[PDB]
Amino acid sequence: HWRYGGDPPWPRVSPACAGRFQSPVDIRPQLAAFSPALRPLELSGFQLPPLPELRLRNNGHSVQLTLPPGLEMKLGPGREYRALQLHLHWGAAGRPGSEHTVEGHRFPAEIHVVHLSTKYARVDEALGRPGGLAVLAAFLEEGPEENSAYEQLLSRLEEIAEEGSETQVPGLDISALLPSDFSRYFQYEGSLTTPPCAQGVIWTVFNQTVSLSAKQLHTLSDTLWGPGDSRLQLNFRATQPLNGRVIEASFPAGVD
Ligand SMILES: [Zn+2]
């Protein structure tokens, strides 16, 4: 069972993790290719009613929320997706833990919403195929006040503190966990960021962050336990070389 960090490498057990087009990456906005074909993201069905409830589980590597059928996400013509699940990556006290970085800057945490192309019917069919999976990624930053949407999930972490434990949470507005600016993002082709590291994943990284209180960020990083009896912390993969890939930007960066 793979773990975050070390020692031992990931490719010893999962060779595809040594592929050339892996995620996450460092984003350098002044060097991204401006692409006016990248239009605002379109989501539908993300505002869920309270019932039915959704599964929330500590899998030892993250906390993962299973999404119900019917959430649709469109990256552009020919690029339509159904949402499957979301999960988080974080650091520890006084240490950030986002997966993507911007000019080498690491943010406190990161949310990933994983989607399946409408071209397939099962995740296993889509693994490794160009565009088969798409992930929406947003950075979580510290703001002054409590984020009410995130509190619906963060208040439930204590009951799933032990690795492998699960609970049920009321339906909520999944789009309220994401930034409000759907027009400004970066996009590139990469991989799953855990084994088996399958390539072909379309990554979309919002430029705008979401704000959580200091207490909420502490709740996220300090509540859960992983394998053995190590704290579930620093659960992010190191950034990977672009190897000639171009990151596109849906907007002009771009001055400083
Ligand atoms: Zn992830």
Residue numbers in the entry: 140 to 395
Task: Quote the study that presented this structure, word for word.
One of the isoforms, CA IX, has limited expression in healthy tissues but is upregulated in aggressive tumours, with its expression being controlled by hypoxia. CA IX is a multidomain membrane-bound protein, with its catalytic CA domain facing extracellularly. CA IXSV contains only the catalytic domain of CA IX, with the intracellular, transmembrane and PG domains removed. In addition to truncating the full-length protein, six surface mutations (C174S, L180S, M360S, A210K, A258K and F259Y) were also introduced.
